[PDB]
Structure 1
Amino acid sequence: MQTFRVYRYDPLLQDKPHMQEFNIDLAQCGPMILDALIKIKATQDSTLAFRRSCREGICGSCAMNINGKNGLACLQYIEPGAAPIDIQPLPHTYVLKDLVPDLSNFYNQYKSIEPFLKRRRAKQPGEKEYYQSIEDREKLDGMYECNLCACCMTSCPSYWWNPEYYLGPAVLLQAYRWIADSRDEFTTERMAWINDSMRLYRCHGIMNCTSCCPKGLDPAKAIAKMKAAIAAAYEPGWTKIVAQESIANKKRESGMMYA
């Protein structure tokens, strides 16, 4: 009979959020935390709201803060004990309802880096897939697996202080994924844009990002590599390069972009 404490907030009432405790029999519940939340909703309090889809850990919609450390509820294991299990939404996020966070800023930041392959020459007729050796493809192994759960985003103290200026561990990891990719031909443009004091250099090497990653990726390692590459490759003409790309985006629709 484990005790579960769940963060609760009603957007209509707009009352002070509080922690409500539920008692669940682990015998009739699945091992994972998400199973307990579903059982609570099904049996005791159907008003509880939370984002869930996969059950495998691949989609990354069920990111939550369990016992003070971010994680995905579907992969997190229930640890029975006298101490109640505390479940809260992602830290320093605007809660839409109960455990459902407001991650719109995270999506906007991700769209900013333009995560799509860019090439100077369009695919010539009769040309098949772009050449890429196994060795080059191996460089992307630790970076293309991100599920965008935002556990790392909300565990970075620098993101707590400057959410609207700092891209965060997840978006910076993806930016280096396209920089590292051999097929992409806009490496200098991407490095020039990311070379900003707020966007990139707010990372202070705290490493709360790598610790909580559900998929075991290493955003801190990738962020460190990107800084080293930028420092070695900087040229006086990078600022002009950013401006020229901004002119190329003049006719784009509204939304975050390269500018």
Structure 2
Amino acid sequence: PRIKKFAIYRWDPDKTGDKPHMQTYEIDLNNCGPMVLDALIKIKNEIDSTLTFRRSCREGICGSCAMNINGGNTLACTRRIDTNLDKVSKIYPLPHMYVIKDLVPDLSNFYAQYKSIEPYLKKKDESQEGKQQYLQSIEEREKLDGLYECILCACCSTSCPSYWWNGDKYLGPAVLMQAYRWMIDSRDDFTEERLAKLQDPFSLYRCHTIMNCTGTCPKGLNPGKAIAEIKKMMATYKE
């Protein structure tokens, strides 16, 4: 028998005067999975099915898990529980975000921001699209490795202090990296205008190279490193 303690954040919108509070749960780790999500699902089906949270692939590629586990933003279905029965796991919603209910945050602004960078290929001549496959050397293609794997969990952005203070006007790591993903795609023809879109004091420049984003990506990606590349382009492109 191996009992593990779980402290979980909670808040019911449909319970008059309810206020954010931690509810502790106990689970026999022998009767459970290795990941944190397994625990969540377990207390969900046996202890309290009022516990609400997003999940889907439980494989670590859809990005539904995004939540703060023991002070860090990661994917509940990939972060293995701490077998140290002495420690009590602390599960909170993604940082500085409006809570819809329990561990479920409102990512509307997040998504909206992603939309503002126009995350899609843009050619100056779209009259011939759909008939021939565009060419791209394997070299030009390697430049995308580490950029296109983004799952959009919002773990990085939601870990950035600048995003915490100015999430309304500051695009955040996640979005900024994707903007970069499209900036260096040899097939896109709007690099110049993509950079010009960041010509203000908030969209890009709220980033002070804190590096929490990169230090928390569940996919081992590097937003910060990308933000820096953008900045360099921003100060050297012409017209």
The answer to whether TM tops 0.5 is yes
How far apart are the structure 1 equivalents of 2:129 and 2:220? Answer: 41
> Are residues 1:139 and 2:176 paired?
no
Task: Rate the CA distance shift 1:131–1:36 in 2: closer, same or farther, 3 A.
Answer: same
Deviations 1:57-108 (A, max 9, x none): 0000011100111000000010122121010100111111111111100000
> Are residues 1:120 and 2:157 paired?
no
How far apart are the structure 1 equivalents of 2:218 and 2:112? Answer: 22
How far apart are the structure 2 equivalents of 1:212 and 1:71? Answer: 7
Paired letter, 2:37: L
Deviates more, 1:126-135 or 1:220-229: 126-135
Question: 1:189, CA displacement in angstroms?
Answer: 0.7
C-alpha RMSD of matched pairs (Å): 1.2
Q: SS in structure 2 opposite 1:211? A: coil
**Residue 7 of structure 2 corresponds to which residue in structure 1?**
5
Paired letter, 1:39: K
How far apart are the structure 1 equivalents of 2:131 and 2:137? Answer: 17
Gaps of 5+ in 1: 236-259
**Residue 221 of structure 1 corresponds to which residue in structure 2?**
225
Task: Rate the CA distance shift 1:127–1:38 in 2: closer, same or farther, 3 A.
Answer: closer
Deviations 1:148-168 (A, max 9, x none): 000001100000000100000
How far apart are the structure 2 equivalents of 1:223 and 1:42? Answer: 42
Paired letter, 1:10: D
Task: Rate the CA distance shift 1:132–1:50 in 2: closer, same or farther, 3 A.
Answer: same
Q: SS in structure 2 opposite 1:149? A: coil
How far apart are the structure 2 equivalents of 1:8 and 1:126? Answer: 49
**Residue 129 of structure 1 corresponds to which residue in structure 2?**
133
Between the two proteins, the alignment pairs up a number of residues equal to 235
- Which of the two has greater helix per residue? 1
How far apart are the structure 2 equivalents of 1:124 and 1:160? Answer: 44
Q: SS in structure 1 opposite 2:74? A: strand
How far apart are the structure 2 equivalents of 1:182 and 1:135? Answer: 10
> Are residues 1:76 and 2:73 paired?
no
Q: SS in structure 2 opposite 1:194? A: coil
Question: 1:125, CA displacement in angstroms?
Answer: 7.9
Q: How does 1:1-259 map to 2 (within 5 A)?
A: 1-13=3-15, 14-81=17-84, 82-124=86-128, 127-235=131-239
Paired letter, 2:36: I
Identity over aligned pairs, percent: 66
Gaps of 5+ in 2: none
TM-score (ref. length: structure 2): 0.96
